[PDB]
Amino acid sequence: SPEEEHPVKAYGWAVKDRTTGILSPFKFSRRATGDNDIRIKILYCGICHTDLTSVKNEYEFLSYPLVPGMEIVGIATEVGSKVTKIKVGEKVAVAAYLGTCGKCYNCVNDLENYCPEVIIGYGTPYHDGTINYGGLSNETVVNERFVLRFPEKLSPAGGAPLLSAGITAYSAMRNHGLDKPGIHLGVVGLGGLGHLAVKFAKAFGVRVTVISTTPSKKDEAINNLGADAFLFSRDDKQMRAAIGTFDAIIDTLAVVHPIAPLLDLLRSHGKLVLVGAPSKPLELPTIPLLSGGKSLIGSAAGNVKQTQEMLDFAAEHDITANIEVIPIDYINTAMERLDKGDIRFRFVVDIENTLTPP
Amino acid sequence: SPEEEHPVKAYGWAVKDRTTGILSPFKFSRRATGDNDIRIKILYCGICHTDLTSVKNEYEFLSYPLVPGMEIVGIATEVGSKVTKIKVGEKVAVAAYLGTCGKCYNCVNDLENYCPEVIIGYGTPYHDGTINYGGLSNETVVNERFVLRFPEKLSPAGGAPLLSAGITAYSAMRNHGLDKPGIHLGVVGLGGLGHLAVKFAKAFGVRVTVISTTPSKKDEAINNLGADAFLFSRDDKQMRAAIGTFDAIIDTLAVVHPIAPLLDLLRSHGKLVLVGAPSKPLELPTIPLLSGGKSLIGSAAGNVKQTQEMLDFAAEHDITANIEVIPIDYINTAMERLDKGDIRFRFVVDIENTLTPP
Numbered sequence A, B: 001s002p003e004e005e006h007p008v009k010a011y012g013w014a015v016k017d018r019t020t021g022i023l024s025p026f027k028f029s030r031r032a033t034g035d036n037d038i039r040i041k042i043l044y045c046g047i048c049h050t051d052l053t054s055v056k057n058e059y060e061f062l063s064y065p066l067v068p069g070m071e072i073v074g075i076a077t078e079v080g081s082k083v084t085k086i087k088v089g090e091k092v093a094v095a096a097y098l099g100t101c102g103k104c105y106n107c108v109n110d111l112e113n114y115c116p117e118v119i120i121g122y123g124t125p126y127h128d129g130t131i132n133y134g135g136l137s138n139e140t141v142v143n144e145r146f147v148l149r150f151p152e153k154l155s156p157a158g159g160a161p162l163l164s165a166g167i168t169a170y171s172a173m174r175n176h177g178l179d180k181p182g183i184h185l186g187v188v189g190l191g192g193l194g195h196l197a198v199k200f201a202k203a204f205g206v207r208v209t210v211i212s213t214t215p216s217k218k219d220e221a222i223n224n225l226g227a228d229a230f231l232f233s234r235d236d237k238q239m240r241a242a243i244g245t246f247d248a249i250i251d252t253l254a255v256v257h258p259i260a261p262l263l264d265l266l267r268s269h270g271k272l273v274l275v276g277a278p279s280k281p282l283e284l285p286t287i288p289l290l291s292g293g294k295s296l297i298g299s300a301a302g303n304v305k306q307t308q309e310m311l312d313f314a315a316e317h318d319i320t321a322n323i324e325v326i327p328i329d330y331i332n333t334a335m336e337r338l339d340k341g342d343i344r345f346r347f348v349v350d351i352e353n354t355l356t357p358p
């Protein structure tokens, strides 16, 4: 039984029946604190589109009962004997992944988010063979390598979506030189990831055009996020006028979409960075890719050193997500609103104040 | 009429009926020598898979009668007054493209193969509005910028496929750093482009594995081409054993094929360089691309300065294609054999000795 699996009792909300996707109160347990482990009392957990996709029963490989949530901000309540960088009582945050092989090139050179055996935030076995439970819970236990120090100047609630959506945008931009004034960057899709991509790029001095299928989002894009331009992707005149005008485009969409129009927007040798995870596959336009010498680049989150650097950057530049703070028993309705796009732009669950045992 | 369109008479073989793809003798004409033009008596024309794709009526944009062939080696018989770099009687070669806009960034910085208005080797209008006729003809006229000096020590017949297949492999490797010892390179498909990619990589000192669906090519791959290894892609054990072992893969296939297994062969941050142009669309597996931080990169031919550089490299390192020299009236049978992969590895038409007027 989940409550007997481990010595320390824990509780949260879980999808017990994968065919319905409904979360309900859930008792379970967490491993004892190892020598390099940190126990974290969870304060806030951001909700991302991957949580929704999991809840919609679209990831076969996940094990149920499923406790989702991978944007965790909390307080260290207990550290192992070998832990030194983090002290009890400190504000901390958890990476979007929980472990790596430790031996491959990526791990040894601190690029460990790209470990072939990276352990994702929930739903799969840990090193001890037990299924991981995510951030919609009262406490978690994480190896110290994957725990970050949360800046004092940063809102815990507004900073929580930085741990998956924020780092994905930040790393993709930093890794591919999309963080310098003079760059014209396009951001496709204005959801959680996209709205943070705009904020980070403005902080970098990058000129940003939001590329959207929702014309009512223009005002939010320009007035609230500070984008330099808004491109309605169904406007053939707007699209043709922007041909060859982008150095790079960051694609955040979780649905199937045509890639060829996006490649046409890029100048020769431009980059299309894919950070969204459509559940269905995409079609590759070979001729536009070849004739333009263009690149399709995948990116996923960021390494833990890059994540700490991002958190410090966000604190100094006051970069937070635009959030709605919700109680945990609102989670099923929030999932519906997230499915309809009725959120600007992130749900964050107040775990400390609204979660109680079953 | 094609013979009256221009002042100078010419002849070759053309697809007159695009629905059959059958070539037959064809009379036409070519423009007078402009100030910057070079008239070229064609000696040899390599046959590439794009010629086959054109004769199979798979490129809607091409105009007919269609004279294909874009791997031309010849002799300069006449130069414009302003031409200085090439003298009459010199052995020359033609780039796989015939013109560019001349104004964009790529043109002015000698990256003109990626000009958005590049004029391909045949079947589309030239600057004067007339359809271009390719290398399956007795002579051609080319602006001097797109004419190369052919090394004396290089076989004209064996060197002819360097002008499209050779430059595509060479440029893709040079542009993305796949030309240095220490790199483990995969070459998918052992056709015209693939077999030249192996030869160039061996000359660079790169370790090369040939990835093929035809096990009977193993001996030529290892003994004749000098590949370090041969991977049968339908052997699931062999494929699983090579997971994460490739720094980069060059995909030369002209047919639709699964790309996710190739992404699995790459290490994290690896590159899949696409140089083949399948007529039907390919499927992009986002999750493998996202998981590894991997790249899909398109590349097309090379710029003319790089082409001259490639030709000189081939002369000093004795790089030629493995060819069957054929007479022009064999072209329809050669297309059938090329369609079936029954050639090791390139057809080259002997134009000077076997082409006669209708």
Ligand SMILES: C/C=C1/C=[N+]2CCc3c([nH]c4ccccc34)[C@@](COC(C)=O)(C(=O)OC)[C@H]1CC2
Residues within 6 Å of the ligand: A050, A054, A059, A096, A097, A113, A114, A118, A119, A120, A121, A122, A123, A164, A168, A275, A276, A277, A300, A301, A302, B290, B291
């Ligand atoms: C930052 C979160 C995203 C979410 N999606 C879908 C794939 C995915 C990831 N975690 C998940 C948890 C539950 C269900 C699906 C996923 C993740 C985690 O990032 C890592 C491990 O470094 C990934 O890479 O899975 C290997 C990335 C990639 C894009």
Ligand SMILES: C/C=C1/C=[N+]2CCc3c([nH]c4ccccc34)[C@@](COC(C)=O)(C(=O)OC)[C@H]1CC2
Residues within 6 Å of the ligand: A290, A291, B050, B054, B059, B096, B097, B113, B114, B118, B119, B120, B121, B122, B123, B164, B168, B275, B276, B277, B300, B301, B302
């Ligand atoms: C060099 C190898 C060809 C073959 N294919 C198919 C596309 C193609 C090209 N020429 C053609 C002629 C007749 C029919 C189709 C084509 C070309 C030429 O390269 C250039 C202009 O620089 C290209 O890029 O077309 C923009 C490349 C790209 C890959």
Ligand SMILES: [Zn+2]
Residues within 6 Å of the ligand: A100, A101, A102, A103, A104, A105, A106, A107, A115, A116, A117
């Ligand atoms: Zn590893």
Ligand SMILES: [Zn+2]
Residues within 6 Å of the ligand: B100, B101, B102, B103, B104, B105, B106, B107, B115, B116, B117
């Ligand atoms: Zn140009």
